[PDB]
């Protein structure tokens, strides 16, 4: 009953220094599943189907690895052997052989390109063994996952409580509770173009009451859209935003 034990190994493979007379087969299949760990990080399992058509007579290692491509550029590889020498073209119990693995860290809006091939590979000038699977990871717009501290610092759970109302044909009033996580608030009112703008500076307050800002507007502002952009020292320019409403008082 063979098993697979793996450790991280990235770099040149010592197998490339020797040209092997006989080479193994390809891989039938490959699929990767996302899981959530208990608390609260995310790790990844990999699944593939080793060849059934007798391609097995010789094989030792199958290294599976990925380049992580976000704003940051990341790449690492995992090399490991199969601990027992195969003799059957399926499980003696039945079905094509299967194995899996865990341990790949996962980040925010990071797309991973995971590809596999058997070890050793072919010499120069033969057919390519390429087999890889593309993937999609979610961001911080999912209702499940507001609980990472990194996104919380972006005020993920913060409720601006924006209440925006029109005083007269030219002045609009907005009310909302302040926050100890930031100091500067701005306002965009968009119906078709920019109708009015203002900037607010306030360090903090212990009472934490609803604010009140006077913002001039041009033309008919009925049915416009209010949007708030909060500044935090951490998120900077990529700070998350929230809607706002327009009502008449």
């Amino acid at each position: 009953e063979p098993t697979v034990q793996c450790g991280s190994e990235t770099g040149p493979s010592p197998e490339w220094m020797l040209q092997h007379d006989l080479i193994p087969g390809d891989l039938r299949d490959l699929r990767v599943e996302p899981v959530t760990t208990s608390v609260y990080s995310i790790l990844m399992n990999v699944s593939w189907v080793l060849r059934a058509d007798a391609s097995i007579r010789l094989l030792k290692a199958t290294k599976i690895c990925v380049t992580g491509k976000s704003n940051f550029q990341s790449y690492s590889c995992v090399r490991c052997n199969y601990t027992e020498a195969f003799q059957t073209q399926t499980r003696p119990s039945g079905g094509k052989w299967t194995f899996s693995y865990i341990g790949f860290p996962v980040e925010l809006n990071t797309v991973y390109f995971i590809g596999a091939h058997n070890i050793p590979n072919a010499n120069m000038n033969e057919d390519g063994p390429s087999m890889s699977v593309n993937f999609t990871s979610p961001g911080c717009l999912d209702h499940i996952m507001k609980y990472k501290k990194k996104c919380v610092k972006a005020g993920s759970l913060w409720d601006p409580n924006i209440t925006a109302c029109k005083k007269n044909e030219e002045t609009v009033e907005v009310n909302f509770t302040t926050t100890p996580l930031g100091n500067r608030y701005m306002a965009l009112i968009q119906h078709s173009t920019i109708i009015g703008f203002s900037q607010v500076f306030e360090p903090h307050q212990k009472k934490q009451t609803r604010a009140s800002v006077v913002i001039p507007v041009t033309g008919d502002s009925e049915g416009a859209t209010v949007q708030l952009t909060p500044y935090f020292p951490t998120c900077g320019s990529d700070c998350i935003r929230h809607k706002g409403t327009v009502v008449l008082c």
Partner: protein, 96 residues
């Protein structure tokens, strides 16, 4: 990222048996003009997209030039390569 840029780009497979890593990607943004910020689907022609590149490290192996005769051998030869990173919105060059 690429789902959010003003000139989005995707990534196309380019496999080789002699490049480390075995896979490299050259982005070609499909947009000949920068998209509109108000709709995200309407085609705004006031902009253009131009590729951004750098130069990166790759590795290759050649068989030994010296006629050793013991084996094919290997060498860690190092030349450079050109690969893109992204597309930028550019104000054109006009005359008149």
């Amino acid at each position: 990222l690429n789902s959010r840029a003003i000139s989005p780009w995707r990534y196309e497979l380019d496999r080789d048996l002699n490049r480390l890593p075995q896979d490299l990607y050259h982005a070609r943004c499909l947009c000949p003009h920068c998209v509109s910020l108000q709709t995200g689907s309407h085609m705004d022609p006031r902009g253009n997209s131009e590729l951004l590149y750098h130069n990166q490290t790759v590795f290759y192996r050649r068989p030994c030039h010296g006629e050793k005769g013991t084996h094919k051998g290997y060498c860690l030869e190092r030349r450079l390569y050109r690969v893109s990173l992204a597309c930028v919105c550019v104000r054109p060059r006009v005359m008149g």
